[PDB]
Amino acid sequence: IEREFEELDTQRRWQPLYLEIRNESHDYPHRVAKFPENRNRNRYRDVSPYDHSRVKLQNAENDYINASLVDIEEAQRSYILTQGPLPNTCCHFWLMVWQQKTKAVVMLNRIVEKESVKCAQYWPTDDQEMLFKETGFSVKLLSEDVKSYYTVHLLQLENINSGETRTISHFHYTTWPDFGVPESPASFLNFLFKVRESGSLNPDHGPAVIHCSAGIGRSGTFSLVDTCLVLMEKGDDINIKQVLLNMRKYRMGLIQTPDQLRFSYMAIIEGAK
């Protein structure tokens, strides 16, 4: 119901609605995140995966990576929300998509040039393959489809330790405004519909990995409107408030501001067609 939106919008009820969702949210444990050795594997000390839903790097010396599995059986939807990899976590990143049989990764942030800020370019921008010998992987850019508000990179992920090959689709939404939320969910909605078109979100493949810089704001927005757009078209009586509360059990802080909350509504409404 959009009347819910118009009602919330009139009475200026966004800061309060969001502020509530913050109180109802429960805090689970995240000790592994805090281990000294895992300190430099986190971009933000304040954003950590819950020990009960965190993704484990299997058979690794250290099995920690700041990523969370988000299960929503009620929609046959499942994703891995993570942080944009750091210069020292790129091979962990790829090791992870491999072990999870991930078919697609959607990136919602821009790679910044500053480089005083980490933000590692983890996939190739030309015909030169990135090699990660520590975990035994190779990544090669097959082709890139550069649209207006996004870009899709076709990547070949090869396990050098066995010759096994897979092709991953890297969807990069490039127009989220620095600071603030988009004024219209048009370009964002199409991007969502394009990754759906690839069929990478179906329960057939492994969980798609979604990420922005921290993996809770933009990443949360994408997940929420995707799950909600599946709860509709199917069952009904969608309570965005609770659905977002059930997602916050797998990973903390999804939706960081009332604007992102409000934007999610707008997207779910317009996208509901």
Alpha-carbon Rg of the chain, whole angstroms? 18
Backbone phi, psi, residue 159, to 5°: -85, 105
Q: How wide is the angle at C-alpha 219 spanned by C-alphas 204 and 92, nearest 5°? A: 70
How many alpha carbons lie under 13 Å from residue 11 in its C-beta half-sphere? 9
List binding-site positions for substrate.
Answer: 178, 212-218, 256
The one-letter code for the residue type at 131 is: L
- The two tokens of residue 191 are 């991007």
Question: In a 3-state reduction of DSSP, which class is residue 176?
Answer: coil
Count of domains for the chain: 1
Surface-to-core class of residue 156, CB atoms within 10 Å of its CB (0-12 exposed, 13-18 middle, 19+ buried): middle
Q: Count the Cβ atoms, other than its own, within 10 Å of residue 27.
A: 8
List residues with catalytic annotation.
212
The CATH number given to whatever domain includes residue 133 is 3.90.190.10
Mention every residue, 6+ apart, whose C-beta is less than 8 A from residue 172.
106, 107, 150, 151, 152, 153
Question: In a 3-state reduction of DSSP, which class is residue 86?
Answer: coil
Rounded to whole angstroms, what are the CA distances from 5 to 24, 132, 165, 183, 266?
Answer: 21, 47, 46, 16, 8
The one-letter code for the residue type at 258 is: P
The one-letter code for the residue type at 270 is: E
Closest to 179 (Cα-Cα) out of 267, 259, 264, 244: 259
- The two tokens of residue 61 are 């010396």
Strands 104-107 and 208-212: parallel
The span from the CA of 227 to the CA of 144, in Å, is 28
Method: X-ray
- The two tokens of residue 54 are 């965190």
Structure's resolution in angstroms: 2.6
List binding-site positions.
Answer: 178, 212-218, 256
DSSP string covering 112-170: PS--SS-----S-SSSSPEEETTTTEEEEEEEEEE-SSEEEEEEEEEETTTTEEEEEEE
* Residues 168/104, Cβ–Cβ less than 8 Å: yes
* Residues 258/216, Cβ–Cβ less than 8 Å: no
Mention every residue, 6+ apart, whose C-beta is less than 8 A from residue 192.
222, 225, 226, 229, 267, 271
For residue 82, give its domain range: 1-273
